Amino acid sequence: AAKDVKFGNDARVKMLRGVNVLADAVKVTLGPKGRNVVLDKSFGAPTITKDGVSVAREIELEDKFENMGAQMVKEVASKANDAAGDGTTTATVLAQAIITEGLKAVAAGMNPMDLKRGIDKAVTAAVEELKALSVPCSDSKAIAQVGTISANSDETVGKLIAEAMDKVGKEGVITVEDGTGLQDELDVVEGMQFDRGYLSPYFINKPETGAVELESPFILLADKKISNIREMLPVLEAVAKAGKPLLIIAEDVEGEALATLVVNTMRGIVKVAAVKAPGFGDRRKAMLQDIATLTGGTVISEEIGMELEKATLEDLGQAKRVVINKDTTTIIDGVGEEAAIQGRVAQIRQQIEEATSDYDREKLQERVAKLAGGVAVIKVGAATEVEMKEKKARVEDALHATRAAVEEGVVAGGGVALIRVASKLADLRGQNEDQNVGIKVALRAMEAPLRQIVLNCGEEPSVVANTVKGGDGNYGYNAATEEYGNMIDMGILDPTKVTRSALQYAASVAGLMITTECMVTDLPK
Amino acid sequence: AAKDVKFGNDARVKMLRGVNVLADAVKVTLGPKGRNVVLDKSFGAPTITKDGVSVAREIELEDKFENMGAQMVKEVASKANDAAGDGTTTATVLAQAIITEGLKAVAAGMNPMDLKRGIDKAVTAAVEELKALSVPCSDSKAIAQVGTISANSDETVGKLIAEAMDKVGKEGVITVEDGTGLQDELDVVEGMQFDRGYLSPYFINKPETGAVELESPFILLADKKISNIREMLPVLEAVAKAGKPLLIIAEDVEGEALATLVVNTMRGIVKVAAVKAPGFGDRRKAMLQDIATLTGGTVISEEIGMELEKATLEDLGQAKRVVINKDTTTIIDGVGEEAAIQGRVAQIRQQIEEATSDYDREKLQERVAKLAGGVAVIKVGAATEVEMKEKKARVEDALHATRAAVEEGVVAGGGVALIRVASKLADLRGQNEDQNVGIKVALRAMEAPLRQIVLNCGEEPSVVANTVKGGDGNYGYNAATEEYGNMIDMGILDPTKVTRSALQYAASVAGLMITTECMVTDLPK
Amino acid sequence: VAGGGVALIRVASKLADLRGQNEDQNVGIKVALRAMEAPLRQIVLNCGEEPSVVANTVKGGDGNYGYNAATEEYGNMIDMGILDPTKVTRSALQYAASVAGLMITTECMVTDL
Amino acid sequence: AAKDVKFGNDARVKMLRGVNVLADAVKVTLGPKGRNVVLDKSFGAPTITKDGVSVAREIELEDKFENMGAQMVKEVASKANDAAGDGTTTATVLAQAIITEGLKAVAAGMNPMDLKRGIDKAVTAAVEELKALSVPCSDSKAIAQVGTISANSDETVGKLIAEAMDKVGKEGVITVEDGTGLQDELDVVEGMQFDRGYLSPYFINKPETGAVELESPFILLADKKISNIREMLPVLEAVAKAGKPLLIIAEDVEGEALATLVVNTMRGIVKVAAVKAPGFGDRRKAMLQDIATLTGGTVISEEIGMELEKATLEDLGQAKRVVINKDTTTIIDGVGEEAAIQGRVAQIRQQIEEATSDYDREKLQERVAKLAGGVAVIKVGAATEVEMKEKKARVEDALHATRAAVEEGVVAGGGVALIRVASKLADLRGQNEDQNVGIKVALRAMEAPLRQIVLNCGEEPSVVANTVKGGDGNYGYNAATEEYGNMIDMGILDPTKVTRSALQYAASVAGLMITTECMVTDL
Ligand SMILES: Nc1ncnc2c1ncn2[C@@H]1O[C@H](COP(=O)(O)OP(=O)(O)O)[C@@H](O)[C@H]1O
Ligand SMILES: Nc1ncnc2c1ncn2[C@@H]1O[C@H](COP(=O)(O)OP(=O)(O)O)[C@@H](O)[C@H]1O
Ligand SMILES: Nc1ncnc2c1ncn2[C@@H]1O[C@H](COP(=O)(O)OP(=O)(O)O)[C@@H](O)[C@H]1O
Ligand SMILES: Nc1ncnc2c1ncn2[C@@H]1O[C@H](COP(=O)(O)OP(=O)(O)O)[C@@H](O)[C@H]1O
Ligand code: BEF
Ligand SMILES: [K+]
Ligand SMILES: [K+]
Ligand SMILES: [K+]
Ligand SMILES: [Mg+2]
Ligand SMILES: [Mg+2]
Numbered sequence A, B: 001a002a003k004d005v006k007f008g009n010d011a012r013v014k015m016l017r018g019v020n021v022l023a024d025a026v027k028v029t030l031g032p033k034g035r036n037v038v039l040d041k042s043f044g045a046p047t048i049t050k051d052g053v054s055v056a057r058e059i060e061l062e063d064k065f066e067n068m069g070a071q072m073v074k075e076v077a078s079k080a081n082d083a084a085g086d087g088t089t090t091a092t093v094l095a096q097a098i099i100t101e102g103l104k105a106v107a108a109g110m111n112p113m114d115l116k117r118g119i120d121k122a123v124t125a126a127v128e129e130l131k132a133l134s135v136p137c138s139d140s141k142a143i144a145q146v147g148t149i150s151a152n153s154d155e156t157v158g159k160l161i162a163e164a165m166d167k168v169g170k171e172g173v174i175t176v177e178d179g180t181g182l183q184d185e186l187d188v189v190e191g192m193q194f195d196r197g198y199l200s201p202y203f204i205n206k207p208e209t210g211a212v213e214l215e216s217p218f219i220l221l222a223d224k225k226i227s228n229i230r231e232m233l234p235v236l237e238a239v240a241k242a243g244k245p246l247l248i249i250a251e252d253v254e255g256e257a258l259a260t261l262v263v264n265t266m267r268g269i270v271k272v273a274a275v276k277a278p279g280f281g282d283r284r285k286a287m288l289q290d291i292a293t294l295t296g297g298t299v300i301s302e303e304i305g306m307e308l309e310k311a312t313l314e315d316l317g318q319a320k321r322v323v324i325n326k327d328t329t330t331i332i333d334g335v336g337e338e339a340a341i342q343g344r345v346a347q348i349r350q351q352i353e354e355a356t357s358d359y360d361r362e363k364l365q366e367r368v369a370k371l372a373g374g375v376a377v378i379k380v381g382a383a384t385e386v387e388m389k390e391k392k393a394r395v396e397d398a399l400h401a402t403r404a405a406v407e408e409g410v411v412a413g414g415g416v417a418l419i420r421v422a423s424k425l426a427d428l429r430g431q432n433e434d435q436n437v438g439i440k441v442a443l444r445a446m447e448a449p450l451r452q453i454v455l456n457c458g459e460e461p462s463v464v465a466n467t468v469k470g471g472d473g474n475y476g477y478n479a480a481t482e483e484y485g486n487m488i489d490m491g492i493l494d495p496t497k498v499t500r501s502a503l504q505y506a507a508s509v510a511g512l513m514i515t516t517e518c519m520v521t522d523l524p525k
Numbered sequence C: 001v002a003g004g005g006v007a008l009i010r011v012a013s014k015l016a017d018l019r020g021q022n023e024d025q026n027v028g029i030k031v032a033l034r035a036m037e038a039p040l041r042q043i044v045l046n047c048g049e050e051p052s053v054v055a056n057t058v059k060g061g062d063g064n065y066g067y068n069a070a071t072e073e074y075g076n077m078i079d080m081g082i083l084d085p086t087k088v089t090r091s092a093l094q095y096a097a098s099v100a101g102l103m104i105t106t107e108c109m110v111t112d113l
Numbered sequence D: 001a002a003k004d005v006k007f008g009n010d011a012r013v014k015m016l017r018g019v020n021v022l023a024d025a026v027k028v029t030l031g032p033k034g035r036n037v038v039l040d041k042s043f044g045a046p047t048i049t050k051d052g053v054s055v056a057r058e059i060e061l062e063d064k065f066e067n068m069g070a071q072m073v074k075e076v077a078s079k080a081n082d083a084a085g086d087g088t089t090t091a092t093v094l095a096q097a098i099i100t101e102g103l104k105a106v107a108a109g110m111n112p113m114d115l116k117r118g119i120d121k122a123v124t125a126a127v128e129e130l131k132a133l134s135v136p137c138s139d140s141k142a143i144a145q146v147g148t149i150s151a152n153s154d155e156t157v158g159k160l161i162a163e164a165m166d167k168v169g170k171e172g173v174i175t176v177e178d179g180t181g182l183q184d185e186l187d188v189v190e191g192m193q194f195d196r197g198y199l200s201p202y203f204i205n206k207p208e209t210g211a212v213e214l215e216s217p218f219i220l221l222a223d224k225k226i227s228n229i230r231e232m233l234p235v236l237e238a239v240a241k242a243g244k245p246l247l248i249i250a251e252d253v254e255g256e257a258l259a260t261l262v263v264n265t266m267r268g269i270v271k272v273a274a275v276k277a278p279g280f281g282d283r284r285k286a287m288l289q290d291i292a293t294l295t296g297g298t299v300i301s302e303e304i305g306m307e308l309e310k311a312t313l314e315d316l317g318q319a320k321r322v323v324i325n326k327d328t329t330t331i332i333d334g335v336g337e338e339a340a341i342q343g344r345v346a347q348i349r350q351q352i353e354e355a356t357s358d359y360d361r362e363k364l365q366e367r368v369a370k371l372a373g374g375v376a377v378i379k380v381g382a383a384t385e386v387e388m389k390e391k392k393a394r395v396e397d398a399l400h401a402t403r404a405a406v407e408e409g410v411v412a413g414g415g416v417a418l419i420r421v422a423s424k425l426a427d428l429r430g431q432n433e434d435q436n437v438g439i440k441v442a443l444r445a446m447e448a449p450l451r452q453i454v455l456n457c458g459e460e461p462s463v464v465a466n467t468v469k470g471g472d473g474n475y476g477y478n479a480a481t482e483e484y485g486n487m488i489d490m491g492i493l494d495p496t497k498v499t500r501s502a503l504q505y506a507a508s509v510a511g512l513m514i515t516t517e518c519m520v521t522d523l
């Protein structure tokens, strides 16, 4: 297909226009006074969303060159959506700032390669500076505060997240489901998580998060390897007959053939997914049998004389709801044998003392933890479907932010941390003046998140930024009450991880695009 | 497909215009002098309707941005209907009012999020105040008044419903059926209600409520679980030879596969529905045995030595009509034998004494209620087809409205309640000036229902409002006669639930819409 | 008065607490007060200095403290003598207001084709 | 009339485009081996012309906004050519080179004011370097060469100018008139010169040259600060009988009465001008009397006892022609008591020995030179009237350029100077990146002229330019010969004023455009 080709500043200006369109879409949402975007999910009702990644995904433009600019920047938001969710809007604002300042410096005739190189140097230093700046976040009050802030200053979500994490243990898995009614509810149920996920992306389902989930799924518990569809046909047959979803757990699968089988058979009949078996060897079988009682199944295994040709609708376990991603699976709640589940808990913990050898004790204490910890499930209460989805997305941000906080600690929120590290890096220099100007471009872009936060308030961004820069330590601006003070005392906390991630990804994508000299795209016909 | 993007006031005006188009369509219908709307239908005869849900669900606009506004405000209306089945128009009017006044306040530069927050605070206070204001409804005459006022001041319909519930009891199930002719008819028949809906939306029949209903169905009576459609092929053959639908009552249905395959193989040759067995465990068996006798069928179980393929057309129960919704199935009647009904009544009635223990007597009294009580059925007599549907809609509204008035009592109708509660909340305040202005926006909207009702009269809305405002308690305006007086003496009684429902959903949706800066929609091509 | 629109921004900052009988009047008051800053910020913008920073510094510094666009230095407006006759400021303001009110209330315009 | 109005980049792009069309038209012609430009004349065959002033003059574009861009540079270029006799297209080329990069930088988003400052900064430095580089044009050889360059390598013109300045001195006054048909000639006459202009502007000549000049001027000389100007009425009546102008040289003049009468009643049949005499006191007296004798008249005052009420047409002086402008007066040729004028010249030479005050020693040593052969009159000739006017115009241009040269010395031509100073300033830097680009824009443009000169030759501009920069001093590329060498030894030498003026005006326009925020034009 014939290509259009543009060069130099004619290309770069079109790229920057498209970047701006995307950034303007996303950035309005930033901070406590940022306000929602309506996305026409034209298959249904439009969705109100404040999540910057959800906005970015939809944005894509008619002009092929402006579209190319947009589609590059969307990467930063998507990557930032990984690495614990929160930080997508700040990542996009940073990206825009670096691009804009970089392209000005390129118009001044600087070597864009050296500008990129300088940007990368500054950013690496900033990461280390944040690393040192970070303060551990252990107390429940800090956790709660982080939850509220990521919840868009919603105190209730902070309370629930803190109580849930403190009830299930810092490591326990928490999941969020649509509201049974107007009130949010917290409760705990006998589930477990394990570190294996779906074996093909074609299993991806409704959520854009790269996840698949199943309601009332059957649960296969295979010790065999799936060398070909000849192993699976009896199992698929039984499940298809049962007309209810299936989770395949197997030691190995030639996933390409399975995907072809999925396209042919599972066009519109039954939802099915496959995952790698847990652990290995004895650990594998232990988890397999653990799931079997948790689900009410049996261990399909040739050592028991059972075979996939023999697997009945009851050797297949069952689950009430299951959520799976490309790397991890969680049973939200099993059918299970309650009394037998708890009895096994006692038995496995007993094996901790028998198997006193360090790593067998380790494997046993892992078992009791993944079993007895259960799962806490937050119910997101809201009167309306629109409010349902909106509140749910904010609760999800809270969980991911809180996970990150307990991982990597916290830093002054409101954009203060970035400006602080920026101020500490003022002495940094590169090999040559091009790199030096690149470093300054990066250090200047770091102001952007604060300036945008205040601008959403409709305050004078430069005034506030100047004041904050004139302060020291956690001195910052409270955008929700227009009071300067110690962000920590106000509890305006950001997880170090999210701020780090946003900066790194923005820097990488931004530095690359600055290097563009030419674009080739389909001719607009 | 390329997205259009709009920002700030350019988006909000488009949103508000769409909202106005929908609201103006719907609001005409409000109150006793409110007009009918004529809805185009592809099939043929346009449907005259007064139901605000019916109108809202068709409104859909060509310009993508006003379309987004309309598809959103449609949700409040349908949520209102689902929550209580009545009060859709008042919900919409409120919603539109809130949106209009909120967007005004946003144009004053107030923070949209604080406006939303303020509105929700006012609405929480107003809901609790309505609850305190509410008065229980128990007297048959009050019940009738509610029905008439819901029926568009149709004395006859409210009288009928009052007699019906006083006969069948307030908790028995009442159903509305197409008239035999000009006379309305009420009769009692040995119908049955059990709390299991359609297991798959594939069953959804033609009616716009999205329900599956079958004329003269056979009633499958399998307490055994199915395994796949393969079980039913010879039965489905016999049913095709009869040429009538079949209700598949089964303990479990492979609906994901089985329903799909039933649809694909039948393609309308035979209508088939699948429903869960009533209750669980022994309940399923004893209850299913009961319904068999009432329908004159046999339980397909080893207790009879019967199997799914073995069921003759005569083993299958026979009903004149069966109605299935998303959560409830009711057998309108069974052929059975009235002598057999009485004999069963005696045997189980006696057996109550043998099983007097708390929860056993509970289930047994459930069983007599759901057996002796019978089904009340209202035949909506109307001279012509369009009048048929229009009147049946009104009677359905009356039944929902009346069944809600016994739940939560009644309040001063005609919009008095809202005004009254609004006036009492005048002293409510928020954390800041923006929330204060949001509270005032909410309280001001509360008037809107009365004003619209008055305007439909062509009377002077502000004058009526000020007079009602100046009055106290149930003092109100009688739109049907243009007399001020004690609304309760007149009986213009609104169920508290509808009012509460309308307000909450109105506020919930409207609150989000204030906070919009940006819209993303497919580019108009 | 202190020239360079200092006078206007000064009085505007002093009246910030003013408000009227209803939200509509309040918006009207806020619109008027925002305008009074406009001249200064313009003057600055022409210089290509940061209008917001200058404005905030002037609002901070009491009385005749202001920005001299000829010299790019803050100081006492009077001492340098960038000083407007009060009449000029007053007149400008009132007349400006007049037009504003006039066009707000107008409903109909008539012209040749 | 309803006007198109547009702002910001909408303005920038249109001017840039318009400026570009101009420059590309002109620049090709820059230097001696310029490219031809076929200028259509509707009458007939087009004028193939290598002369860029003519091209530029003739370029006028159809889009109103684009026309702005062209006319701006034209005007500013023209002014450059007025400040000094050369540099129309050089100022143009520079203009383009600055503007283009400036507007690009502005479009990218740098602060327009900061670029302005940075350009201004680099320009000021370059002017200082030019001043240092200048060498005086002391030698008639240099003078001759100067004329050549300003004459498009017309050796003859340079010869004529140099001959004139030898006859009258560098500070003497040369003048040019239509001559003896085929043959050009030079001769000298007893004119006069002094650095005083008109006391009121309304005297301006019929043409818009801004001077006033008078044919057969009568001359009145009085050491009086006349106020009521009552006594002059008989003089006006006598002069109106003669029908010829009168010049009044005074201590002060009541212009609010003379100029009034000169505007109203003297509807063209007579013209008058009024000027201060130079110096003061006994200097002014001696100046007045000597100018009178040259003009064949007498000093007139009540102290003389014979006044404007009595002064005959012969008490007043006379001249064949006189020129007056806002800053200077020159009597072309007094009628004079020629024999008594030389006698007085000798007497004034004696008076050099009679003075003792140095301000009067000055008055004498100047006026003796200013009297002795005070004016030379170039006569232009050609085989046709069209060549006649062509050659006359070029002569005048060369004259002006030569004047500038002796004022401010000369520099290595061919853009050697510019490139030289540009290389010297490469270390300059500004306050911030915006000003830095401004400097780099300015410094890059100074190269442009040279490169253009070379590129018209169709040599490789960059090799040449780099060789020049790698050389030292006046080393440069002689485009008429492709030889490298010392520019001055070739005498391919620009007057410094040309270079300075060209540059500064270039920068000036560039600045205006960079800060141009809005433009208003008819539809
Ligand atoms: N009350 C507050 N005052 C100042 N800044 C805040 C406040 N609440 C949140 N923020 C800041 O706004 C950002 C959080 O808003 P959010 O829309 O979640 O951005 P992101 O999507 O990038 O996480 C963080 O930079 C946080 O520091
Ligand atoms: N006779 C009456 N006088 C005043 N108001 C009335 C009268 N009858 C009904 N109304 C009011 O009209 C509204 C019901 O109109 P309806 O079309 O059913 O709207 P909705 O669909 O919201 O119930 C209620 O507020 C009710 O109180
Ligand atoms: N040197 C200066 N620095 C700052 N402001 C100045 C200076 N000189 C004049 N002004 C201000 O410029 C404004 C008027 O600008 P001007 O272009 O003259 O418009 P106007 O013709 O309406 O006065 C006045 O407020 C005056 O005080
Ligand atoms: N023989 C030559 N070699 C190189 N440069 C020359 C030569 N003759 C003239 N120049 C240069 O040409 C430039 C002037 O070109 P010209 O066409 O006269 O433009 P303008 O008259 O508009 O200034 C001057 O820089 C001058 O030194
Ligand atoms: F970037 Be966010 F907090 F969704
Ligand atoms: K956001
Ligand atoms: K209605
Ligand atoms: K030339
Ligand atoms: Mg967040
Ligand atoms: Mg109703």
Ligand SMILES: [Mg+2]
Binding pocket: D085, D086, D087, D149, D150, D151, D152
């Ligand atoms: Mg020349």
